[PDB]
Subunit: 241 residues, 4 copies
């Protein structure tokens, strides 16, 4: 049946977060074997035990290049081949540019971009070897439009898209796809503040985690074998590309 | 269970060949009741899929026939939930040599019949608080392409039209979204990183995605399904 | 000097309107011979008389295909060949889609999209033979973003970008570029909702568009084709 | 004369390479006081000696965070306020993704992106205080289209646009614009060619004019954009 993912192996980073949890759940529901990454192991084994079978758990700190490298090799080995890498984990250090410290720029780049670079590198050669794979990168509406307060975040998320494009071209012949999803504003750790944003969402409501989760399922499906290099916007029409 | 359209009523224009037919098949496979538009007897496709099918011939060049088309499908299906604007033509050739007819014609089908048909179905979808409009544009609407000044206009305008309508009817839970097929000769293969032509099923799948309840929060967008030929 | 336009011949459509006159003045001041299109010929003469030397007057109703063809021909012959075409005139028939008329769609389509086609068709061949030319199309922010109550306008301004892209690819080799400019909002509940979305917090003036025309029309922009220049206060960032 | 820059103070990074030089020339021919950054000092003093006066020379190693900051401080002080910053210098560490080392990523991001962060952070506040500024970032078509062999570069160049959009939104009301130019541009040099409608390579002056346009008073209503100068290779 359509969009089936039975037997497919997925690794989802930031899998205890709002979106990562939701994505993990959806992959599982479609029959995937799901590896869940997180910073805290306790929160992870908790999502595990709740989903039942076909779950692996991989704690690691994404700041830490060497743990990211290990995260890759672990997943690939325990899972017996990762078919689906979802790069969802990502941090913020918001503030005005003219007050923005090196440490706030660095941390965001090294997490949102370079840990994506190293994890993806651990898993792409294997995927290519197998002639099958999906690399799905959670960017943000903000990487396309820009946003005040987030010079670092927007850079990291626009860059994520252009990394995605370059890789996609390079590995398309080997039946491995790479695509981005761009969430608008989604219910999470987050009234005037809120009203200003809602006035630009034509659909006049916030997003939910299922909205991103289902876009992941779509892109990871066989049926999406011919989509690579693209950015799928999920945002109630907040920005229309 | 995921991406289930059982009981939802969909109209696909240009359902007789190529993408329309593949789109219609996937809609059918997912439970939808599928109204089949085409220019010519179509009765064959109807007979292949059997149950949950309607047949609506019309000439899309005839604004009157497009109005009736929409009034008829709305009426006989008990309300269209999914409109797929698929049908479209080309009158290719260099800009210098391009007839007023070749311009007029392409715009009349690819743009204005879409204006008209959609206008027929939008209010009813609004009043039901539910609706999908999915428009098949083209890679060439975004990239431009020689020999196709008229086509590219129509396809580019199709996107533009969709965004604006997307903003108006969002609060009534009707989405509107484009799908940009790629190519669907080794000059063409050269520029496709995936080194294959697309097939109908690749576009039909994207239709189902966008048409699904799970895409309620997607609107105003263009989904490129193109082997990586142009990356936006 | 740079961005010098002396010796060049321009036709500007809707030259009497806000963007058109600004566009005309800036081309003129940069040395160009400008042909002013409009519908109300008496408004053309007023502009001419103010501007003096290096001016032609070409009244024409752009809703009239025949007149659009004749307009091209007359500008081509009388000006001694047109070097720069600025497709600027364009109408609105605003309103909610579900209320929109057959005539409300077709009239925007035929002015904003097909008269551009015919006019441009009239002058490209000449520019191709001379192996030098500039087609410059005034699109709009909303053609890229979309905007409610403007499904017809948005279709026409997105299509015009698509129009330009295809044409740009055809004639690039014969040194005629074709580009679009996308103005944002240009010169009290409606107003300041718009203003709330412009980070620069001011409206745009005709001179902001006029400068982008001069930039694209210049020899210095020979390697620019098929593009869209946004001049919008940072309202939309492409 | 339209697009006059007389008295405006500009700082150009990578001013010895092809693009940087043409940019420097065009700013200086349009009346601007131009400070020339470059890795190699010999070529700077050469180019500085060639153009009249209204030239300052500041060598710096952009891989060195502290030298980046010192470049900014020195250009702000020695020219008594920079008006126009052209972030042009960038590097490549090309190679297939699957063989790309930690350093080939790291070196590409530190220069093309994070040294741009620093430099720009050194000068924007001063610009905002003076109610006037131009930030002009040289990105690349590849940042938009993507390109095999250039995963690191594509990331940095894409990142560069995103950063520009964000900073542009923050400071627009202060009359400082921030914009990107995207240039396009063995003999499978002929494969690139066929894909260019204009059937021609980019030269420096094509990019140099786009900079003068964006640096002008006339481009004051333009902020947060990417100007493609690529002969139709990609049409956005």
């Amino acid at each position: 049946s359509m969009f089936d993912l039975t037997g497919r192996k997925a690794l989802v980073t930031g899998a205890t977060g709002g979106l990562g949890e939701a994505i993990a759940r959806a992959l599982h529901a479609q029959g995937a074997i799901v590896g869940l990454h997180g910073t805290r192991e306790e929160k992870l084994k908790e999502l595990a035990a709740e989903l039942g079978e076909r779950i692996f758990v991989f704690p690691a700190n994404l700041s830490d290049r060497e743990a990211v490298k290990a995260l890759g090799q672990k997943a690939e080995e325990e899972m017996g081949g990762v078919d689906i890498l979802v790069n969802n984990a990502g941090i913020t250090r918001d503030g005005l540019f003219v007050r923005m410290s090196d440490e706030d720029w660095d941390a965001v780049l090294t997490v949102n971009l370079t840990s994506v670079f190293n994890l993806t590198r651990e898993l792409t050669h294997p995927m290519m070897r197998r002639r099958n794979g999906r690399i799905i990168n959670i960017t943000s509406i903000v990487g396309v439009t820009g946003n005040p307060g987030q010079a670092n975040y927007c850079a990291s998320k626009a860059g994520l898209i252009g990394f995605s494009k370059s890789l996609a071209q390079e590995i398309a012949s080997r039946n491995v796809t790479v695509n981005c999803i761009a969430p608008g504003f989604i219910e999470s750790a987050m009234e005037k503040q809120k009203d200003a944003i809602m006035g630009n969402i034509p659909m006049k409501r916030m997003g939910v985690g299922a909205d991103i989760a289902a876009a992941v399922v779509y892109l990871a499906s066989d049926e999406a074998a011919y989509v690579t290099g693209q950015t799928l916007h999920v945002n109630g029409g907040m920005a229309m590309i």
